């Protein structure tokens, strides 16, 4: 059973020529057998011929197509963990963001025009930075020209990174008074404590410049929303989360120093987050919790929901690490059902629970067997 498509489909002859040379390609990784997938294979057929009349010029945006029943090498080589996925390619770079929006035309179509557009805040001030949103990161560039190859690789990395980070340019003499050393890269961390970092690179070498400024983008302690839940829940980790109100600042700052001193060592074991806790109040309830009692500090192994004892327990060494711990341990999972484990310095007897710890709720927000094949499980 085959859908016919008017869309290049890709195998391993055209594959690397193909994404190569397209600016933007956005590739379908279907299965024939796939509901999910003969559902968004007229959609995704439309979208196409909206966007190629929008962007029509040689390259600048393809639609293709990956049969990963006949190209199972391929489907491995881009790490398909199910069906349908939608790629987002740059030049032959796979973006780390899948398209997971709504399955529609217009959803779609949306979704590359917001992707074709510039990125970049030009600055016209040099005063704009002093009222720069420090809760954000920035990185900011300054230029002596917009038609030079510094800014056309700086413009690069803005397309890729645009959803990490904020990217902020400025030109001629607006920027000259930041430019005695010639054009110049800034990161400027959140927070007004943090020191800018500045680029020592060639800003005309692309790999080291992108590597520089990613470097910059990645956080150590994610942000979880909605629209990143389900790339989160792919990494396969489970989630060590701090749910705090977004105007209260200190807990992340003090949860973030935490993080960085005791749990180096669990870096590929759990996922360090933290949440805006009136946007996720349904996950809270998983662990009776409402904003009221945060800061609250929970793992989610994807079976269950643990709590930490209490916020300030975290300033305690060790006490962290030993929550990510015990959780590996099962030492959480048995001190649900039966409470605190007794030592002799430290036992009256607790209630026996028999029922099972509470259930996971970022479980939840995982790739749903109600809209994607799933290959993993
Ligand atoms: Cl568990």
Redesign the pocket.
């Known amino acids: 059973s085959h859908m016919a498509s008017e869309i290049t489909s890709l195998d391993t002859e055209n594959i690397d020529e193909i994404l190569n040379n397209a600016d933007v390609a956005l590739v379908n990784f279907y299965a024939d057998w796939c509901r999910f997938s003969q559902m968004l294979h007229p959609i995704f057929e439309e979208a196409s011929d909206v966007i190629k009349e929008e962007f029509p010029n040689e390259n600048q945006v393809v639609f293709a197509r990956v049969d990963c029943d006949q190209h199972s090498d391929i489907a491995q080589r881009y790490r398909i963990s199910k069906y349908p996925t939608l790629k987002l390619f740059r030049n032959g770079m796979m973006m780390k963001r899948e398209y997971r929006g709504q399955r529609s035309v217009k959803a779609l179509a949306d979704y590359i025009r917001q992707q074709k557009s510039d990125p970049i805040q030009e600055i016209r001030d040099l005063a704009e930075i002093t009222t720069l949103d420090r809760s954000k990161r920035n990185i900011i560039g300054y230029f002596e020209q917009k038609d030079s190859d510094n800014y056309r690789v700086f413009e690069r990395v803005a397309n890729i990174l645009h959803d990490d980070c904020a990217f902020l340019s400025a030109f001629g003499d607006v920027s000259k008074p930041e430019r005695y050393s010639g054009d110049n890269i800034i990161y400027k961390p959140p927070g007004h404590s943090a020191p800018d970092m500045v680029y020592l690179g060639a800003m005309t070498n692309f790999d080291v410049t992108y590597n520089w400024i990613q470097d910059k983008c990645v956080p150590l302690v994610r942000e979880i929303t909605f629209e990143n839940g389900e790339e989160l829940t792919e990494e396969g980790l489970?989630f060590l989360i701090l749910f705090h109100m977004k105007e209260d600042t200190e807990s992340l700052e003090i949860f973030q120093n935490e993080v960085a001193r005791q749990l180096i060592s669990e870096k590929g074991t759990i996922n360090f987050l933290h949440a805006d806790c009136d946007k996720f109040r349904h996950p809270l309830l998983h662990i009776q919790k409402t904003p009221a009692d945060c800061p609250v500090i929970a793992i989610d192994?994807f079976?269950?929901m643990?709590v930490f004892g209490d916020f300030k327990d975290v300033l305690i060494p060790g006490k962290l690490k030993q929550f990510v711990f015990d959780?590996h341990s099962?030492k959480?999972?048995r001190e649900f059902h039966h409470g605190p484990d007794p030592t002799d310095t430290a036992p009256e007897q607790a209630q026996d629970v028999a029922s099972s710890?509470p259930e996971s709720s970022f479980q939840k927000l995982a790739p749903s067997e109600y809209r994607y094949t799933l290959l993993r499980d």
């Open positions: 489970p192994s079976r269950h643990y959780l099962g959480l999972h710890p």
